[PDB]
Write a protein that binds this ligand. Structure first.
Ligand SMILES: *[C@@H]1O[C@H](CO)[C@@H](O[C@@H]2O[C@H](CO)[C@@H](O[C@@H]3O[C@H](CO[C@H]4O[C@H](CO)[C@@H](O)[C@H](O)[C@@H]4O)[C@@H](O)[C@H](O[C@H]4O[C@H](CO)[C@@H](O)[C@H](O)[C@@H]4O)[C@@H]3O)[C@H](O)[C@H]2NC(C)=O)[C@H](O)[C@H]1NC(C)=O
Ligand SMILES: *[C@@H]1O[C@H](CO)[C@@H](O[C@@H]2O[C@H](CO)[C@@H](O[C@@H]3O[C@H](CO)[C@@H](O)[C@H](O[C@H]4O[C@H](CO)[C@@H](O)[C@H](O)[C@@H]4O)[C@@H]3O)[C@H](O)[C@H]2NC(C)=O)[C@H](O)[C@H]1NC(C)=O
Ligand SMILES: *[C@@H]1O[C@H](CO)[C@@H](O[C@@H]2O[C@H](CO)[C@@H](O[C@@H]3O[C@H](CO[C@H]4O[C@H](CO)[C@@H](O)[C@H](O)[C@@H]4O)[C@@H](O)[C@H](O)[C@@H]3O)[C@H](O)[C@H]2NC(C)=O)[C@H](O)[C@H]1NC(C)=O
Ligand SMILES: *[C@@H]1O[C@H](CO)[C@@H](O[C@@H]2O[C@H](CO)[C@@H](O[C@@H]3O[C@H](CO)[C@@H](O)[C@H](O)[C@@H]3O)[C@H](O)[C@H]2NC(C)=O)[C@H](O)[C@H]1NC(C)=O
Ligand SMILES: *[C@@H]1O[C@H](CO)[C@@H](O[C@@H]2O[C@H](CO)[C@@H](O)[C@H](O)[C@H]2NC(C)=O)[C@H](O)[C@H]1NC(C)=O
Ligand SMILES: *[C@@H]1O[C@H](CO)[C@@H](O[C@@H]2O[C@H](CO)[C@@H](O)[C@H](O)[C@H]2NC(C)=O)[C@H](O)[C@H]1NC(C)=O
Ligand SMILES: *[C@@H]1O[C@H](CO)[C@@H](O)[C@H](O)[C@H]1NC(C)=O
Length: 394
């Protein structure tokens, strides 16, 4: 019998939940575009992998308020990134990556449908823009100021002049959570009962696809069994996800279940039909159109190098060489305590791009899902926390 693991002040679990002792690392990998003018004339894109750029994460919960007798708890997870130079391939402020111009592809999408109405497109033809641009890794991640966005900001202050993939994500949270702690049942430990004051999502077609299942992914309920499926809600992924048992593992001195993300998640099927907007029509297996959660931006999520995806996605881009061991998402969980020992959470950011006759910027470019960057969010238990854990077992 152990629930030493519940969120209650003074307990083992709560302190660890509030200020995680295990350091998490996020490393970024970029795809440098080697043939922009040839792509614009309709040839196959050739890219180059650049990285890692390693950032150590700072984690803790704020806004903590207990609720409902000690069954529920409200919190926000703040997260910050500290760059590690010696563990990275180079200095992200010096290093240049050439890739798609995301701000202008974004406002274009905004023009055809109207998030921004059509009419200020006349900016684009006033100031002509290149589809492929060159910025530093630091500019691409943490933001830079854009010509066209700046011009719009004048008329629409609600719209930011700045764009970055992770822009204004440093030292902030993903929004308001209320977590279900474990004292009604150990099973429902650190389970998510709401996000921004709503119990389900807006975005997806089906009821079911809009469901929020599982934990935030940083931990799991104790006494996990091999047979059972484990649910996660990665907010940034804009949908719930489950992982399934793969193998038995050992991390440090501790036994572990190896849970991985199955191919069922991104496959074009059945249950996943609700993720294809607007009608049940999917780009294919292995991709997720997140435009809805990404502010109307033509962003397509996928796994690194289109791992677990239709091959035509891989074939479309020269330089995509997917493999299981490098690009898979796995989590090694201590079965008894539901604690994560080792994990690699990996996913890719891509951009949908197609030829447009109203926009000369698009040229003759092929219709494809264009890779920009992927990442590995990892954690590894040290031996002093491990051995202390393995004596605490008894
Ligand atoms: C991803 O792919 C992109 C595009 O292919 C690469 O971006 C290029 O990066 C290289 C450097 O790695 C750049 O080449 C350098 O440009 C510098 C800037 O040139 C301007 O300024 C100088 C004055 O300082 C002017 O004379 C010049 O006309 C330009 O106006 C130069 O300063 C560099 O010169 C030095 O380079 C080598 C030594 O490094 C020597 O041979 C030279 O004599 C001199 O010492 C150099 O020419 C290039 O401009 C970038 N291209 C673009 C489009 O931005 C990324 O590097 C690549 N990413 C990775 C990780 O590889
Ligand atoms: C986070 O994710 C990234 C991306 O997956 C990951 O970086 C990768 O690490 C792996 C493991 O170290 C690297 O794979 C190696 O590649 C070199 C290239 O020559 C090989 O020599 C290595 O081969 C050894 O191990 C293999 C295991 O099967 C054997 O097949 C082989 O014969 C050797 O024994 C190994 O394959 C990979 O190159 C990097 N990728 C990048 C882009 O850096 C990172 O490790 C993950 N975790 C952490 C904590 O960073
Ligand atoms: C990825 O997902 C995106 C969003 O989930 C997809 O974009 C959606 O699908 C198409 C884009 O081609 C749009 O459908 C058109 O919408 C426009 C705009 O409608 C609005 O404006 C009219 C008139 O101003 C107004 O009456 C309406 O109420 C709307 O407010 C119409 O002109 C078209 O006829 C057609 O309806 C969707 O609107 C668009 N949605 C969003 C939220 O952007 C995108 O296509 C997906 N990508 C892939 C590759 O599948
Ligand atoms: C989050 O909610 C549930 C997690 O369990 C996911 O939906 C579940 O999907 C399975 C199969 O796809 C359903 O199995 C069904 O069993 C019931 C009877 O028990 C029956 O009505 C069906 O015919 C089928 O046999 C399961 O019931 C269903 N869960 C619920 C509550 O209906 C859902 O996909 C998850 N969403 C995400 C985004 O992960
Ligand atoms: C994200 O924010 C954190 C803090 O909120 C930054 O970490 C600090 O950076 C300053 C300036 O580089 C240093 O003086 C501090 O020592 C850092 N704090 C710690 C705990 O080391 C971090 O640099 C920011 N990262 C990015 C990419 O902006
Ligand atoms: C995703 O799956 C659906 C079916 O679940 C595909 O639609 C089918 O397309 C094939 C073409 O090979 C036809 O034979 C079927 O009759 C179609 N069925 C339906 C219900 O449309 C759809 O094309 C798939 N998406 C992609 C990108 O391959
Ligand atoms: C968690 O506790 C039990 C175990 O599954 C379940 O019946 C209950 O509905 C859950 N509580 C909430 C608030 O969802």
């Amino acid at each position: 019998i152990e629930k030493k693991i519940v969120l209650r002040n003074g307990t083992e679990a709560f302190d660890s939940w509030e200020k995680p002792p295990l350091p998490v690392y996020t490393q970024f990998y970029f795809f440098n575009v080697t043939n922009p003018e040839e792509i614009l004339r309709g040839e196959t894109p050739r890219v180059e992998e650049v990285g890692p750029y390693t950032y150590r994460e700072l984690r803790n919960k704020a806004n903590i308020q207990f609720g409902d007798n000690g069954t529920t708890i409200s919190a926000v997870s703040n997260k910050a990134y500290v760059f590690e130079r010696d563990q990275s391939v180079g200095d992200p402020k010096i290093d240049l990556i050439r890739t798609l111009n995301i701000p202008v592809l974004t406002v274009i999408e905004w023009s055809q449908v109207h998030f921004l109405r059509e009419i200020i497109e006349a900016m684009l033809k006033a100031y002509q823009q290149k589809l492929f641009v060159t910025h530093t890794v630091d500019e691409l991640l943490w933001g830079y100021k854009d010509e066209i966005l700046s011009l719009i900001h004048v008329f629409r202050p609600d719209i930011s002049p700045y764009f970055g993939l992770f822009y204004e994500k440093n030292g902030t949270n993903d929004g308001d959570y209320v977590f279900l702690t474990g004292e009604d049942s150990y099973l429902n430990f650190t389970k998510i009962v709401e996000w921004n004051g709503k119990t389900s999502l807006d975005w997806w077609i089906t009821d079911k696809c809009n469901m929020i299942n599982g934990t935030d992914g940083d931990s799991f309920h104790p006494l996990i069994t091999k047979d059972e499926v484990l649910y996660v809600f990665p907010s940034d992924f804009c949908r719930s996800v489950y992982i399934t048992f793969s193998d038995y593992e050992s991390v440090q001195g501790l036994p572990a279940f190896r849970y991985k993300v199955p191919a069922e998640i991104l496959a074009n099927t059945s249950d996943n039909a609700g993720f294809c907007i607007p009608e049940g029509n999917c780009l294919g297996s292995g991709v997720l159109n997140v435009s809805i959660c990404k502010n109307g931006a033509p962003i397509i999520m996928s796994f690194p190098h289109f791992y677990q995806a239709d091959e035509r996605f891989v074939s479309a881009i020269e330089g995509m060489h997917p493999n299981q061991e490098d690009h898979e998402t796995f989590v090694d969980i201590n079965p008894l305590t539901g604690i994560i020992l080792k994990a690699a959470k990996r996913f890719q950011i891509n951009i949908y791009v197609k030829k447009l006759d109203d926009f000369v910027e698009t040229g003759d470019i092929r219709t494809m899902v264009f890779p920009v960057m992927y990442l590995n969010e990892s954690v590894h238990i040290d031996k002093e926390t491990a051995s202390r854990l393995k004596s605490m077992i008894n």
